[PDB]
Amino acid sequence: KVFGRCELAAAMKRHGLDNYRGYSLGNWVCAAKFESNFNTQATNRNTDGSTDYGILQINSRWWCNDGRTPGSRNLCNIPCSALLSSDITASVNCAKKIVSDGNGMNAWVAWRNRCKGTDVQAWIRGCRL
């Protein structure tokens, strides 16, 4: 599935990303667009043998196990293929674990290098969220 802008903003808000541990909704929508282009089926092979999965490009060396990554930490206790779903629940729950376990949103390359410091409210402009 490929989300629309307000569509994804509403789904993230209704899954508790309105302001999760100090990160307002616009940050999450911004990261999803830069990481996956709003595509829940997005994958990306990395140079270290890991792979990023799903709407938030969750990495297989730290957060999920895909059976293809040597030394996967699987800190979200989930198979990576489970994050390729039209419903974002599993990715949201793992994202909450990610920001809690010492990372904040710095874990996302796209958020720390592109979203941070910008007018993130422009991402939810007009959605009434």
UniProtKB/Swiss-Prot annotation:
Statement: the UniProt record of this protein carries the keyword GTP-binding: no
EC numbers on record: 3.2.1.17
Catalytic center residues: E35, D52
Disulfide cross-links: C6-C127, C30-C115, C64-C80, C76-C94
Residues that coordinate or bind substrate: D101
Reaction it catalyzes: Hydrolysis of (1->4)-beta-linkages between N-acetylmuramic acid and N-acetyl-D-glucosamine residues in a peptidoglycan and between N-acetyl-D-glucosamine residues in chitodextrins
InterPro entries: Glyco_hydro_22, Glyco_hydro_22_CS, Glyco_hydro_22_lys, Lysozyme-like_dom_sf
CC per GO annotation: cytoplasm; endoplasmic reticulum; extracellular space
Keyword entries, A-Z: Allergen, Antimicrobial, Bacteriolytic enzyme, Disulfide bond, Glycosidase, Hydrolase, Secreted, Signal
Major site of localization recorded for this protein: secreted
The protein's assembly and partners: Monomer.
Further details from the record: Lysozyme C is capable of both hydrolysis and transglycosylation; it also shows a slight esterase activity. It acts rapidly on both peptide-substituted and unsubstituted peptidoglycan, and slowly on chitin oligosaccharides.
Name this polypeptide is given: Lysozyme C
Lineage: Eukaryota, Metazoa, Chordata, Craniata, Vertebrata
Gene: LYZ
